[PDB]
Amino acid sequence: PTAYALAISSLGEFNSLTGGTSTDPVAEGNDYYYRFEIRAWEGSSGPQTNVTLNVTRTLGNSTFAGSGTKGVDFEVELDPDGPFGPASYAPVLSADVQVLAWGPTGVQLRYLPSLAPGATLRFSLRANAVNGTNTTVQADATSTEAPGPYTVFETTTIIP
Amino acid sequence: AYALAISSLGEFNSLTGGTSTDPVAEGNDYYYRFEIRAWEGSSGPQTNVTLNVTRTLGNSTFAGSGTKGVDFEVELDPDGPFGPASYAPVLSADVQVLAWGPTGVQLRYLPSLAPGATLRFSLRANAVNGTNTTVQADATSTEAPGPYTVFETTTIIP
Numbered sequence: 592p593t594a595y596a597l598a599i600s601s602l603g604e605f606n607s608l609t610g611g612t613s614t615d616p617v618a619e620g621n622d623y624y625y626r627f628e629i630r631a632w633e634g635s636s637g638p639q640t641n642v643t644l645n646v647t648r649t650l651g652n653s654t655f656a657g658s659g660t661k662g663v664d665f666e667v668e669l670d671p672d673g674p675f676g677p678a679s680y681a682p683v684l685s686a687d688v689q690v691l692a693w694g695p696t697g698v699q700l701r702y703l704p705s706l707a708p709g710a711t712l713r714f715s716l717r718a719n720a721v722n723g724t725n726t727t728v729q730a731d732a733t734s735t736e737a738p739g740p741y742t743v744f745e746t747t748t749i750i751p
Numbered sequence: 752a753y754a755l756a757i758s759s760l761g762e763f764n765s766l767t768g769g770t771s772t773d774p775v776a777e778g779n780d781y782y783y784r785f786e787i788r789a790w791e792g793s794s795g796p797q798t799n800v801t802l803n804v805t806r807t808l809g810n811s812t813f814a815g816s817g818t819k820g821v822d823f824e825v826e827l828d829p830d831g832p833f834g835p836a837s838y839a840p841v842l843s844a845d846v847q848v849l850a851w852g853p854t855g856v857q858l859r860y861l862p863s864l865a866p867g868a869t870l871r872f873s874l875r876a877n878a879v880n881g882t883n884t885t886v887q888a889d890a891t892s893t894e895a896p897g898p899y900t901v902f903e904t905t906t907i908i909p
């Protein structure tokens with residue numbers, strides 16, 4: 592059997608930090624947002640601690656924007672019962688997310704509360720579009736109990 | 752003149768609608784969803800818009816022999832995010848299945864894809880193992896060869 596497991600998925604690119612519509616391609620000089628989901632297995636023995644997202648630009652010239660302010664540069668929402676219950680995504684408190692790194696090529700965010708079995712976190716991250724070459728980002732999820740690696744690669748077409 | 756985009760939408764427990772999944776338990780079916788999106792600034796419509804999906808890691812397989820409405824679905828949103836028209840299924844004859852096997856599928860949309868329009872592809876897979884499945888999805892057209900590629904990953908509970 593298995594004690595703990597995590598999943599990651601890309602949801603694509605968006606024109607707003609929360610709600611709004613999907614985009615890609617994006618015109619050079621515009622802000623756009625990446626969204627990723629980290630999901631705890633419903634069969635997990637208990638809560639998972641130090642659930643971390645690490646996102647790095649691998650290709651292209653788009654940069655993660657700003658200095659890393661919650662509600663502007665990034666947002667983290669918790670769906671407490673995931674797809675197993677009718678509770679919706681809601682923003683978490685500022686004190687629940689630690690910004691371990693925030694730079695143009697790389698961000699790292701840790702969720703401090705434990706993540707219950709079946710619960711899902713949605714991360715939204717602001718980028719600045721630059722160039723006529725595709726931007727690719729690698730997104731990696733870990734917890735103390737489930738180190739992974741769990742990795743996706745999302746690609747954005749930037750119109751020059 | 753022309754440009755295309757691709758995005759992963761993650762994994763689902765149904766071919767259309769239902770809810771998001773991942774992790775998946777071994778022995779269950781699940782569905783990958785990908786979107787190909789024509790640039791709204793494109794000169795004209797784009798022909799032979801193709802999705803190629805291949806397994807890069809793990810043991811999960813694309814399921815069945817490639818029957819529309821069972822193993823895969825293609826939906827068109829004719830104005831994409833720029834207009835309030837929704838996704839609707841396309842006719843069986845609008846989608847050419849160039850390849851369909853356990854490690855690889857290739858699907859071509861035969862009508863031309865208008866500037867700003869989006870295609871959403873759903874593909875049935877069989878979950879096997881205690882190692883992550885990774886799939887590579889590539890989009891191409893005649894006028895925007897790309898290739899444009901994403902890599903989506905599924906946790907399989909053994």
Ligand SMILES: [Ca+2]
Binds near residue numbers: 598600762903
């Ligand atoms: Ca996934």
Ligand SMILES: [Ca+2]
Binds near residue numbers: 675
């Ligand atoms: Ca819920």
Ligand SMILES: [Ca+2]
Binds near residue numbers: 603745747
């Ligand atoms: Ca994309």
Ligand SMILES: [Ca+2]
Binds near residue numbers: 831835
């Ligand atoms: Ca629409």
